[PDB]
Structures are given as C-alpha cells and as structure tokens.
Symmetry: D3
Subunit: 270 residues, 6 copies
Amino acid sequence: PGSMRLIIRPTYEDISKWAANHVAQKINEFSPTKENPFILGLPTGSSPIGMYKNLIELNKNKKISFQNVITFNMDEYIGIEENHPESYHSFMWNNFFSHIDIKKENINILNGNASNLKKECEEYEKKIKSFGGIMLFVGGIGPDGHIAFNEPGSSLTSRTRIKTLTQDTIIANSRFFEGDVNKVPKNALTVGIGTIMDSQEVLIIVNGHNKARALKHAIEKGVNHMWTISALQLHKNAIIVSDKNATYELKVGTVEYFNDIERKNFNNDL
Amino acid sequence: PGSMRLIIRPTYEDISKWAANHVAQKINEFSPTKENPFILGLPTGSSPIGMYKNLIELNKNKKISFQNVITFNMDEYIGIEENHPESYHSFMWNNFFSHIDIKKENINILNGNASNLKKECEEYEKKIKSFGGIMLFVGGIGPDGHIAFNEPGSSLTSRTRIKTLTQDTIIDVNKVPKNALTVGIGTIMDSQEVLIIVNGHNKARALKHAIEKGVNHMWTISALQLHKNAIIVSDKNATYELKVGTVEYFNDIERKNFNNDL
Amino acid sequence: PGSMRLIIRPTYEDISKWAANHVAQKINEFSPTKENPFILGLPTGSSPIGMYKNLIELNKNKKISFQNVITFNMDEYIGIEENHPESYHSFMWNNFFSHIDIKKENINILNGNASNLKKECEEYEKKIKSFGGIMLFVGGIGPDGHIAFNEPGSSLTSRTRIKTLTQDTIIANSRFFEGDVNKVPKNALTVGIGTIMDSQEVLIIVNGHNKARALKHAIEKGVNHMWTISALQLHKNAIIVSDKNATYELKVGTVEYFNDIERKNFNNDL
Amino acid sequence: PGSMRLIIRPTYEDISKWAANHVAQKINEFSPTKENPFILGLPTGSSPIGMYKNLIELNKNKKISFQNVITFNMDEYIGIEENHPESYHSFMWNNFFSHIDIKKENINILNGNASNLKKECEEYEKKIKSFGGIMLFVGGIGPDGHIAFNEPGSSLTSRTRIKTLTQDTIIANSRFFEGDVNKVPKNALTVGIGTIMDSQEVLIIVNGHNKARALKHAIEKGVNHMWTISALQLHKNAIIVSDKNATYELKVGTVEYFNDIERKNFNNDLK
Amino acid sequence: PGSMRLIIRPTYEDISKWAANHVAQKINEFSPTKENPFILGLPTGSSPIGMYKNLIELNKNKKISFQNVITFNMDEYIGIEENHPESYHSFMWNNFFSHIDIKKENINILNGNASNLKKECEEYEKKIKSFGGIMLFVGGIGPDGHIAFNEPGSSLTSRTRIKTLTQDTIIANSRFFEGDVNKVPKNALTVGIGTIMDSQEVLIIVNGHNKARALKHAIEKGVNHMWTISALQLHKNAIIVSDKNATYELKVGTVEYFNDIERKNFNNDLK
Amino acid sequence: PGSMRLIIRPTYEDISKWAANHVAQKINEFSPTKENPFILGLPTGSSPIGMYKNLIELNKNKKISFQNVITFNMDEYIGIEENHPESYHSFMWNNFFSHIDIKKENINILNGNASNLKKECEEYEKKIKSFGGIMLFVGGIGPDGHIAFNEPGSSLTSRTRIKTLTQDTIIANSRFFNKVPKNALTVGIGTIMDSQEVLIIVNGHNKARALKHAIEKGVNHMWTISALQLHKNAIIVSDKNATYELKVGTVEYFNDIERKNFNNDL
C-alpha cells in the first residue's frame, strides 16, 4: 500500500488464519526450489500456535509445501537437553515440524548446548546471511513489548547473542517448569532486534488486552528501547496483525486510519 | 552551525523569500556548469508557491540561473494524462518551469503512465544516483506531519514506490486517480541537504512532533532528526505549539551562526 | 547480560571508582601491545574528574599501564592557543595525561588552530578508523542531555564537525573565562553522535540531581535529537553509571529492573 | 448507571434527535405545572440547532409541551441590539422560541444592555436560585474545550460575569456576523462554570473531527482550566452525546467502556 | 506533618500491620463512649483482610475495643440474600464483625434488598450525618484506580447511589460466583467519592504490582475521573499505605520525598 | 476579563514594579479608612523583595499610605524568638514594615510560640474572617510549585496548620543559618484561596517547569500552585525566563487577553 500495515480482526482465531494465509501466499508467490529456497524465521510461545495449526492444514490440502523452506528460530535456552519437553527444539517439533513436509536439514535452531556459545551465535548470523537473509520473519510480543528474549533495554540494533533472563521473564516462563523459578534455565541464545530487522519482511501477531499498552507503544509512540517492538517503525516492510482486544489503547483515529488503508488497498485497481 | 536549524519569520511571505534566497544562495555558491550541474529536489502543493514566485522574480532580475540545474519532483499520479491540468507535471510547468531559464531535458518528474511502474520507480532512484545524489531537496509537510505521499506509518527509510491514496487524500471523488508514484523518506534523506517550509496554525502540531518529540513513524517529518543537514523554515503561526524555550533556543542559534566569524 | 546496563551507586565517588575500574578492566583484559594498542575515547568537564583521579592512583600502584593506550578526545575550541590554561589540550594534560605513563604521540586531540578545519575533522575521523575504531568511549552528559558539543538538535548520526556554541554553553563555560561570555571562544571542533556510536563500547557517567531529567530522557523516553544522549538506545554495547541523585526522575520499576539485571549477571554461571 | 455517560452515534443528525428525545423525556417525566415548572438551561451556537429543530417537531406532534418550562440561556453579547438577528436573543427566538408553545414571561436571557452589568449577572444567579436551580442544562463545546463564553483560563468555579472576548472567539464567532471580525461585540455576559455545575443534570452535545481533541481532554485527561469542559468530571450527573467523528482522539478502550455502560444501563433489570 | 502521607513498607504483611495499628491508635486516642462513639468506614475485597486479622488480634488482647464504634460499609450487591456466602454482609461478619466486641446495632451496611433503592441510599447518607460524619474511612483501590463500586467515570463528587456494574467489574468478581459472569449481580449500592471524602480522615491500603499504574495516577497525575482515587488529592487528611511492589510506577524522587516526610514526622518533637 | 490573567514582562525588576503598582492600584481604588480598612495577605522569600522595595518607594513618594492596611503573613517558624534575625517576624520588619507608614497593631503574623499551636491556627483563621476576608493575597512559588510551606502533596484545600519541614528546606535554609526549627505554622492553600483576589510573582528559569504545571497542566497536588485554576480571581505575573516551558500559543493567548483588557471600552 506504501506504509507499515496494521490488520485488525475480531479474534485470536481470525488473526491466526490471516497470518497462516499470509505466510502461505508469500512462499507460494516466491515458489521456492532446491536452488532458491524460501527463508523463514519463526517464533515460539502461545501466539503462533493458531497460525501453526492453520499452516499444517493448508499443507495437508496441498495448498503449500515446506520442502524448500529453510527455517530459523528466534531463540533457545542454554543448557537444556534438546529432548526436554520445554526446550524450544521440542516446542517447534511437536507444534509444527512433525506435521509438515519440511526437510530436517532445512530446520535451524540455536544450539544452547554448544561448547562456545559466542561462536554458535556468530555462526547463526553467518548461516542466515549465507542464504541471503530471512525473507519473512514471524514474531509475537510480550506485554512489555519484548520480542524473543530481546527484553526492555535491548539495543535497537542488537544481534544474536547470549541473554541472561531478567526476573519478569523467569517468573512468566516459570509456569512451564512446574511453577519453580529455580528450574527455568538462567540464560538463552537469542537473535537480536537487528537480526529480525534484517529480514525483508516482518509479521507480528498480537492478541488480548494484556498486550494493548505494548501495541500502543509499538504504533503510536516514538522509537524506544524500553518497548523493543517499536524498532519496527524503522523497517521497510512490517505488518502487525492484531485482534480487537489488543487495540484497546490505540486511538479510535489510528484504528480507522489503518482500517481505511486495508479497504483502499483492496479497491486500488493494482 | 553543526545542528538542525529552525528559521522563524513573521509571515508566509517572509519564509517564502527566505527559502527562495536560500535555494538561490546554494546554487550560486556552487556555480553549476553543464559538466557539474546543481541537483535540486522540489515539492508541490501550496506551501512552496510563495518560494516559486520569488524564485521566478529573482530569475527575471538575473540573480540566479537554472540553465545547469537538474530538478527531481517527489511524485505523480498514476494513469492521469501528463498534460491534464491536475497532474503534477502540469503543476510544475504552470507554476514554475514555464517562467524560468530551465532546460526541458534537465527536468525529472515520475512517469505515472510508464508500462512498468516498478521499473519506473527503480530507474528514478538510479537516475538520482547517476548524478551522485540530490544536493538540496526542498519539502513541505501536511498537518499530520506527512511529506507528500509519505504518510503516517510510512517507513522512516522507504524508497520510491507505488502508493495507494487514503480516502482522506481522495476527498467528484471517483475522478481522482487511485494511485501515485512517490519518492520515499529514505530517497529524500539521501539528499546532502533538506529544507522544509512550514506555514500556518494547522501545521503547528506537526511542527511540534518534528522538533520536540521523538522519532515516530506517525509523524514522517520526525525522520529529519536523523539527517546530517536539515533546515526548517517556519512562520510564527506554525510555532504556536512549540515551547517558548525551543523558539529562543533556535533563534539564538541563528544569531550565533550569523556572528560565528566564518 | 545482552542489554544496556545502568549501574547505580550511592555517590559521585562510587561511580568514579566504578568507572575507573571498568576502564582498567577492559584495558587489562585486552592486554595491549605496540602492534595491538587499546583505543580509548575520553571526555572533559567535571564528570570524569573522579574517574581520572582513580585511574591515576591505579597507574601509580601499577595496576594498569597507559604505555600502549591510544586516546582520542571529544573536542577542542577553535582559535585557542594550545597552551592556554582553558583549552582542552591543557585540561587533559593537567587533569590526566601529565600523571600517567602515556606516550605523548599516542594522544589525539582535535586541533582547533588548523588552517582547514573541515579537513582536520575528516582526518580525525580517518585517524580513528586507521586504528580500527575506538574500543571504549567514555562520556558524560549535560543537564539538557548533550554530550560534548552535540547540543540539542544535533543530528542523531552527526560526524566530527565545526560547531558554533549556543548561549547556554557560552554562559556555562563563562565561569572558566572569568565570568565573561565574550572571552569564550565562539566555535569548537567536536566528534559527532555517530562518531561516538561507532565505538565498540560506550560508557556514560551521570551524577547529581540536575542531570535527573536528562537521565530519564536517556533511558525511558523515545529516541529524540533534543536529548542527544538518547541516541545510545541504538548502540550495541552501552553502559550508564549513575549516582542515586541522578535517578530521581526514573521510575522505581526502572531502577529495580536494571539492578536486577546486574544481580542476574553476577549469578548466571558464565 | 451512577457514572458519567457518553452516548456515541454515527452523525450530527443522530445525536440531535437523541438530545431532543432526552430533553423531551426529562420534561415529560417531570410533568410540570404553573406551580411546579421545569427549569431548563439552553445554549446558542450551531451545536444545538439540530436538537432545536427536533424539539419543534416533537412540539408540533404533541409529544412535549413548553407551557410550563422556564428557560435560562447561557449568554448574550454586551451592547448588541436585542432585535438584531446576530444577538442571542434573536438566535433563540428565530431557531427555537418562535416555534414552540413557550410563554414569553418564562424565557430568561442575560440583558447585555443593562445599566449595571455586574448587578445583571448577580440578578441572573438569584433568579436561577429563586426557582430552585436549573434541572437540565444543555451545552456545547468549542474546539478548545470552551463552554458558553467560559474560554480557556476561566476559573473552574466561575460564576455569571462580564467576559472580555479573546481574538480566537471573535474569529470563530465572526462566522455569525457575516465573516466580519470587527462586527463581533467585544464583550459578553455569561454564566460561569460553577453556574453550570449547579444544575441537577448537564447534557453536552459534541460533533465533528474539529472537536475530537476537546473530547479527549474532556473525558480522558485531568481537570484543567485550559479545557473548561473538563470541569464536568466534578458534576454529579453529566451526559455527553457525541457523533463518531468527535471520538477520533479517544482510546478505543474509552469508547468500548462507555458503550458497555449504555448496554449494561439498559439491561440492568431496574426501574 | 501537614501533607498527604505515603507509607511504604516491604510487604502486604507490613502494611496490614501498619494499617491495623493506625486504626487502633485513632480509636484509642479519641477514646469513644456510648454518648460519643467513633465513626469508622470500612471496605471489603482482599486488600483489608490483613488489617482485619490484625485488628481481631489487637481486640482479643484488649489493645482496642469496638464496643462504642459505629461502622459504615462501602457497598453491597443489589438482590443478593444477606446469608449468601458472597454477599458483603457475610464477607464482613465472616472476616471481621463475628470476631470482635462490636455491638450489632452499631453496624451499618447498605441494604441491597430494600424496596426503594433510592431512599435506602438517601437514608444511608442521612445516617452518616446523624453521627456528625465518618471519622476515619478505610479503603483500597482496584487496578483501574476505582474505589468501592466508584468505577472510572464516576463523578469526583458522587454520593451514595445505585451503580450498574460494568464488564470489567463483573469479570473480576466472577471468580467469587462460579467463574460465571451471569451469576454476578448486575447492580450494587455504593457510597460515593464525595461520601468517602466527607470523612475527617481517609486511609488507603494499596499492594501489588497490578496496582502500580493506579497508585501513580493517584499520587503523581492530575485529578481525573478515570482514576477516581485521585480525588483524595483534594482531601485534607489522607494517608496511603503501600507495599514496595505497588510503588513500581512512581518516580524514585516521589518515593524518596514521602519517605523523608515520615522520618522528619517521626523526629519532629511533637505528639 | 473574567479569566485568569498572565502578565509577562522582560525582567525581575519589571515584574516587581508591575506587582507593586497593582497592589497600590487595588488599595487606592478601595480607598481605605480606619472603619473600612484594606485587608492584605503577604509573602516572604526572595520573590517579593523587588515588590517590597518598589512599594517602599511609592510610599515615600506619597502615592499610597499603609495607615489603614491590615496585613496577614503566610507563616512563621515554631520555637524561634521573634527577635531572631532569621524569624519571619524579622524578615517582614526589616524588609518592609520598618520603612512604611503601617500601624503596628494592623500587622498579623502567626505566633509560633503560642502555648496551644492548634488554637493559634484556628484563631488566625477566625481573625481573617473577622475582618471579612483577605481582599488581595500576594504570593510567590518555588521551583517545585510550592507556595511557602504548602508543598508537594499538600491538600489542594489545606487550611492554617502545623507543618513539619522536609530535609530540602532544612538544607536550603541552612545557609541562612541542625539548629533550624523543625516545624512551622502556615496558612493553607484553602486559606489563600479564600481571598477575593490572588497575585503570584514568578521569576527565573528555575521556575519555568512550575509555571507550566500551574497553567497548562491539570490540577495536581504535586504542584500546589495549580490549585489557582479553581480560584475565581487569580493573576500571575512572570518574567520572560519563567515562561520558557510554556507553549508559544499560551504566551500569545494571555498576551492577547492583556491587550483586549486594555482596549475593552468598559
């Protein structure tokens, strides 16, 4: 249309469908091959689950193939067995990779057990750039505007790196490790805001009242390292899909403005 | 001076004369030849009308020549007849290019009738570079802080592209063209120097976001905080939402700049 | 830890010590030689005085050597005699360089008496790059958020350049030219914001109630050319060290957030 | 429902009708007599014209009578001829009082031609109190949050007083004096913010994008003398009716919150 | 010390103890009699439970007596049976009144099953006034700054009245009614903001991160009807007791400022 | 004009002169006699010194007489000798009362050595009312918006009362001196706002942020001066430096009110 895009739909399910379709459409138009595959960045968390389910379905109905899609994931804990049910390796396999025609060797996830964690990070960044860069990175946001383990105060140009988890993250993630703060791994490897920003296109899925304040900071306020999602304002091709509830802190006029862009870009004759 | 400059003058006429003189000063100082021409970016709309009248008047009175000035315009509607009175081509010729010693071939305006619109955008960006960049781009802003078709939410580093008009810009209504070609915020930012003319009470809130508030994609003009050499010239009405201290601060810079012994 | 760090200590003496120890720590671990020297950016003003005093003592107790350290300063006045007691050449020699085992040909300060000032600036930028860039730039901020002569409205990507001084700077600096505003040199040469941002690591020292507002704009408010320190939000490796008094306009939760990062860092097992 | 209400509708026509019906309802439920009349405060300006037209039709169609309604207007200019079309006296007669079954002696308007203007104001306040206060005051707001001639900087507790008009108000109101800025009277008599707040109930009509910023400062921002409308936060029984356009600066959540109050209020199983 | 006070302690347990002690100290110093009773206003919700526990202990230990204490509670649901486990009548008996030496006839709770609900509210305000006003009113606040059922948009000078509950109140209280929003009574009677602020003294208990935004809007931001607690800024004798977690949105300087007020208050050579 | 006024003049000396003439103007227009005296409330601190010097000059030039002016001051320290050079009594005497034809018995200052301090505050309130109220109260503000001892967090409707000083006031007033009096008696914001009219003098860059909160921001107990938004008849007089945090449009708005108030034909 000519600007950052905000797509507002009523429910979590509707945004999940819009997103899955959008990912399918980008890959299908690209038409990957063994020689020129599609490079896809993916999130974990509750946010992308509906999208994952919809993509599995489209794949079953042969509306999309992952044979020539190469994936990079955002992050993984340091010092967790790949087979631990709460590892992000397991999250991805059980929620997505097991159910689609993806090639095991096309899957890239940070190795939180590497001997040299600093090199593992540098190598991930090299691998991404060896493929020409991520074509589409899909992500989600936290209530404080974080993406991945890029927590408030993360540099707006940060790269893949070691991350010690702050108290808020250990608390929030503690529910996956039997309510026990002592059982959440202390550290993680994570792509940076800069890494994500290097993508040719960025899609963010946001839902619920608890992300409303953050969506306000992403959209309407100035670029600010306390709300690292605000970095997206600098990206050339970014899209945020939000449910109605995550818009409660936006101004009426902002919603109308982005609603009209979608209507006008529908009837544009191009 | 080594910082942004905000030039405040009592009226629309004062800022028109000031901006005309600045363009005229920049071009004379550089002394353009057929071999080394001056590369100038230009706006449309009502804001620069005054400037254009003054520039015409200085061209009659032999204070400047446009013989070796290459110009680039920001935009054009897609599908409109080039010679349609409402086209950007027509705006430029009728209000400026018809009254000055400019050469037809040194004029660059986007062709919204190109067979491939994307390539037209690509070539336009390639053309600017083939001259080694705009030297001075002059612009205006909307009350929502937009610069031409780079509207709120435009990427604070976008390039020349097809832009679909928002219903607000559309308002007959079904006669207006649905799409435009436009340079990007990044295209403008590439310029060696950027001058923005702002006038009137309705631009005051935009000016405040441009100057005092943080870099924000809802106010396109705020991308200028990141440019190395930006000047804003504003009349008094457009300053009504600035702090007294901001005004005194930028006024002092002007006096100290005037008296720096350089 | 993988974010901006804010180190808060009770007094100006504590941060002075903290900063000296940090500088010493980075030089000692790099272990510079004649072929591989450490590149150090430095500030003037009263901010770093305590740090300089501590670095001097550490040098006397042989806990650090400046023999293979190359320094670049932020600024100098245009048209002041090098040996004038108020020049920044004199500031640096008298408060610091006179007192450490630094080699004189390793010291770089902008020459405000150079025939072609625009070229002096270009050359200073070229000299920094000839060494491969500044490895640690230490800076201080003004009550209005300025660093060095990058005053409000300095471009957030500014380079080394001629700068005309504003009244507030002339008035403030007039104390050192016997309270006469007219004895203050009118222009200076200064490194830009981008120049400081090019450094691998930036450390900012902040003290006192009259910097509280500026620290707030630096840490909590969006990137903004009126508060040029806010540009550090975009830096990959920035640390701010502050006394308690300069934190008064931050939120309680902000201080606790950055205090927790520090404690986690210490307890991450890395 | 025991809170402020904000009633949002698509257009100026919708809110005008809604406001007319609300007024009709309060009057009909009160059921006034000569001994016990209904006391109604009214504004001028363009905001209430729709409401006035609707109130005339309701009157013609026997759904409301004004026989026992006593009115007090907000303001009148000083030194304008009572019978000149540009006066608030004439505005009220031409747009409203001429077309309804009101009794002439029950109409109250500030006398901008009184010998002692200060005493005129004091008498106005006493006359309001003499009837037991205003039961419903209808007002509008300006783009800067002003009500009547209570311009930004007016005391949040102001009473009826002499008011010297600012250039901004003269420019705006010149639309009512053939665009001639020098035809606008320099001074006005006006009820105060306090006077308005003494009303049992207040109804405010707001429309258009150019009032959006004012509505935000009325609803979402703190009590502030630069936005005199914000004073209603202190009123016991305030209603604002707004078209959609005037809501553009409110948070989505604010609209959703007041919409839900209307929904809950109607479905609350009470009388 | 002549200003609002903000007492910051580490935990909920500390503030509960501080609040209980402060109530006992006020009642003991007044030293009430049958002829001259202490008039005490009280909240429900989880906030005051700590305080209630402490007061019961103090009472058993004869460190405070409720024999000549008249109480008024904030609110009660409409159309709930007094015996219902989740009524406020029961909350108060079960968590407080059953365990102390209070006289049953000295206990005043709004009657949500009254035939004329308006008269009930009116009679509640009259009764408060018949005793010369509330001497100390204790309250808490919600995450949106509400107090009692004085939800956002409630008038800053509101009195006792029927309140239709909004979506977020219904959702938050659904946890006490089988997690089913359709079981939560739709309406309540509630004292107003004006009713609370009529008290000689107001003591507010705040705890937890989820109250941090509201406390900031209470302490630092302008008087604003969307954060009804901010009205305390106009009260002459207001105290807030907060745990450390509820202070996360306040400025470092605000916390230091009120902490210093407490040290200087303690060390002032007056009592 | 029927709104608050903001009078802006270039310098401290200009606003002191403006404030002095405004006080002489209100007094002279009232034309006080012993039977109907003029009731005046007054400030201390550095702010009004200029105004006090100008009113002394006006008094010697026979342009005003204080014979039938009853004054009330805002505060006084608890447990200081009135004769102490740093007491509020001594400040007023030495900076104003000694130099003008005021009657000694027409002068009111809180007695910080009263045996019952609370009764002293109540009695001060009663005395103000006994005269039928203050007709004009002159005040100043601090950088944090405080009005004398009515400091951040004071009730926007506070009355005369005992006030315990903060560390900042004990520190800032240790130059004028641990031997600082820890408490003071002070009139309240509510007390000041009972006046028929209030004039506030604001000077210097360090009060610019306070002036912004007074005028453009909502009523807020952290900025005591904002309470004036509720007063029926408030005037602020300010030099240019203290307007630095106001919007251009606010300055031009109030300047136009000052122009229209001159040219109104009333």
